[PDB]
Amino acid sequence: QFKDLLLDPLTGDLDFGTPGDRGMRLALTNQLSLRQRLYLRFAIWAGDWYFDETFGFPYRTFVGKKTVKAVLDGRIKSEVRQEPDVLQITDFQSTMDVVSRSYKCFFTVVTAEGEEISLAFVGEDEYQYPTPPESNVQLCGDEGVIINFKNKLYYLINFRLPK
């Protein structure tokens, strides 16, 4: 439920929205929040962000060196579980090509969805305060009491005659 500015999954810029409803949006669904929380966590190289030297991933250790596939998978699979709301990891297809020296892995992560605790900070309210009456209706009655009775009588006259 971690709120934050929404990042476009397709381009990487802020998700200002479609041309018909351009604006700014907050990440509300846990899925969207977790997506960008993993994306930033994996995209920032370790130590390259000032104000926090411990954040990021240490790509320099592996890239450019002769490395064992098994060691890399452990670190990749470990960084994911640093988020407190990750249920499990389903599958992991780690493959390496020696000709091009490229490495490419696949996997998915499962996360549940929570409640909103309070709507005070977001948009709307859930209550249905009453509406003041109109004109002399309060002190003298209402005509609808006649209309509903007339309709009931008419529908009952309709019911008895077979159709």
């Binding site: 476009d8 381009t11 995209a43 390259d48 962000w49 000032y50």
Partner: protein, 165 residues
């Protein structure tokens, strides 16, 4: 090798801060940059005006609207003086506080009002002194009262002004 006065506009303020984008993650997305640039460039204007708030308050460059405030603290009121010469009188009176009215000293004060060769001074036996002006750039009658003040208690003075030799 370096200026002692550190009060200067910060060089290349805008590109700084952008240097703190971690690993070019957002660079080239043209959506986050504009949002950040719009906010940062506002500080540019404020950062620039921080200098004039200090630079313009100096007596050398102070405009008449506020130069009066500087003069007011020193007791030198505008009276009927105009801006270009009001600056001069402020300098002259202030400089008088560390003077002795010697021949070498008098030449120095007149030096700031008429360039290098614009003034000369003849001397006489019985307290007579003379002032010559060649390249005046301001009207002298209003400056005259001060020109008397920085002279000995018993000076006898003549004033003659002309353009060129």
């Amino acid at each position: 090798l370096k200026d002692v006065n550190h009060i200067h506009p910060l060089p290349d303020f805008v590109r700084g801060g952008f240097d703190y984008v971690p690993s070019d993650i957002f660079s080239g997305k043209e959506n986050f940059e504009q949002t950040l640039r719009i906010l940062l460039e506002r500080l540019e204007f404020i950062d620039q005006k921080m200098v004039e708030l200090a630079e313009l308050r100096t007596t050398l460059n102070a405009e008449d609207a506020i130069l009066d405030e500087i003069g007011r603290q020193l007791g030198i009121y505008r009276n009927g003086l105009n801006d270009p010469e009001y600056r001069a009188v402020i300098m002259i009176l202030t400089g008088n506080n560390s003077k002795s009215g010697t021949r070498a000293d008098i030449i120095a004060t007149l030096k700031q009002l008429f360039g290098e060769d614009g003034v000369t001074t003849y001397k006489g036996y019985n307290y007579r002194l003379d002032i010559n002006i060649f390249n005046t750039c301001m009207e002298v009658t209003d400056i005259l009262p001060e020109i008397i003040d920085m002279l000995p208690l018993v000076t006898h003075l003549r004033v003659v002004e002309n353009q060129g030799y």
